[PDB]
């Protein structure tokens, strides 16, 4: 084929001329690796402050929308764009913009080849019984899955916790588990006012 | 322990149907045969398709050789009362009778 993704462009020309950069605060956010199903529910105060906007073909064309403002073109001698990264325009204060996305956040399920931190409890419900499942749970510390009047092969409380994070060893034991609600929020690429740039943050500073 | 469907099934199209599935799979297919009443379906079984011009206009095929005529093909003759049909009439000739009917 021959095009852009796999078809020629007629709406990505409009992403540069989508708005004027009237808003004084922007931030590069990594909300693409988290899924679109959960991404639309957390964003209610996230849109109305400037919205989640702009394409990633036009992220290089973004430079003509910084010359209008007092902002320099690059953020801190680098645009910081080597990832699925989108711009979120904000009207919230200099301290509030540091935690604008993390105020309402949620993660996606853990994939093959990565563990990810699991802070929230795992779901429950009737899923039969399996004796071979107990042999795989011997690697883990808790070897008990049947709880209460119901019967099932996974617990109602998270056994996978922070501290057990690794590259690729205990990640195979999560494929034995039948459900993956791995919460680690969303990820700031950088924080930025209108001239000065900062590192990713969760606090007011 | 059982799961139930109450699906209708014509009496003619089962001719050792319940016997096959029962033996093939006992327990996971136990058909209990229970009558109810005769369902009426939109189809008109009749001998010989008359005039194909009509058909060419097209609103299904009926009063002809059909899915419905499978049941009414040649069930008349179980040896039968006659070879096919023997009947005599005196309703013919409208002029001699002098009728408008």
């Amino acid at each position: 084929m021959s095009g852009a993704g796999s078809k020629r462009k007629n709406v990505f020309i409009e992403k540069a001329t989508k708005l004027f950069t009237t808003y004084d605060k922007m931030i590069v956010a990594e909300a693409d690796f988290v899924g679109s199903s959960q991404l639309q529910k957390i964003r209610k105060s996230i849109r109305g402050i400037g919205a989640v906007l702009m394409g990633k073909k036009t992220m290089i064309r973004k430079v003509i929308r910084d010359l209008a403002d007092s902002k320099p073109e690059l953020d801190a001698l680098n645009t910081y764009l080597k990832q699925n990264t989108c711009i979120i325009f904000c009207k919230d204060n200099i301290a509030e913009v540091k935690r604008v996305i993390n105020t309402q956040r949620v993660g996606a399920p853990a994939k093959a080849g990565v563990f990810a931190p699991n802070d929230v409890i795992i779901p429950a419900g009737p899923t039969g019984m399996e004796p071979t499942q107990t042999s795989f749970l011997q690697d883990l510390k808790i070897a008990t899955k049947i709880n209460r009047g119901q019967i099932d092969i996974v617990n109602e409380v998270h056994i996978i916790k922070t501290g057990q994070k690794v590259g690729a060893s205990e990640a195979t034991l999560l494929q034995k588990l039948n459900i993956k609600p791995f919460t680690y929020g969303l990820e700031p690429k950088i924080i930025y006012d209108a001239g000065a740039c900062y590192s990713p943050s969760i606090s007011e500073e | 322990d059982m799961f139930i469907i109450k699906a209708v099934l014509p009496v003619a199209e089962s001719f050792g149907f319940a016997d096959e599935i029962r033996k093939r799979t006992s327990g996971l297919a136990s058909p209990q045969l229970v009558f109810s009443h005769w369902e009426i379906i939109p189809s008109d079984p009749f001998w010989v398709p008359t005039t194909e011009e009509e058909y060419l206009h097209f609103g299904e095929k009926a009063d002809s050789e059909n899915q419905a005529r499978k049941y009414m093909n040649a069930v008349r003759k179980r040896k039968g009362l006659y070879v096919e049909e023997k009947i005599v009439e005196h309703a013919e000739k409208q002029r001699t009778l002098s009728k408008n009917k």
Partner: protein, 102 residues
């Protein structure tokens, strides 16, 4: 089958504990409730569940309940079905309290 059932003065219900209650038997029996017979219940093929396929006797009990329920339904077509329920609720007439069985 129907013809057979009304000739014979007695009866006996053979139902499977690994294949459920037989539908054929049920169908004919319902006609046979209009005739005077003495059908004794005997639940068969627990030899399949307990020994041959080899499942634990805890499961057997569980299985049996379903069978019993099925039988209750059968009973309830043209005969009464409340004594059975009562029995299920509390086994036999005497010994009403579990503490007293000690």
């Amino acid at each position: 089958v129907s013809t057979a059932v009304r000739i014979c003065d007695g009866c006996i219900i053979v139902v499977d504990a690994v294949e459920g209650v037989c539908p054929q038997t049920q169908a004919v029996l319902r006609q046979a409730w209009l005739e005077n017979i003495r059908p004794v219940l005997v639940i068969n093929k627990i030899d399949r569940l307990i020994v041959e396929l080899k499942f634990t006797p805890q499961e057997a009990y569980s299985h049996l309940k379903n069978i019993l329920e099925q039988i209750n339904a059968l009973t309830g077509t043209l005969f009464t079905s409340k004594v059975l329920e009562e029995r299920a609720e509390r086994e036999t007439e005497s010994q009403v309290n579990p503490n007293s069985e000690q």
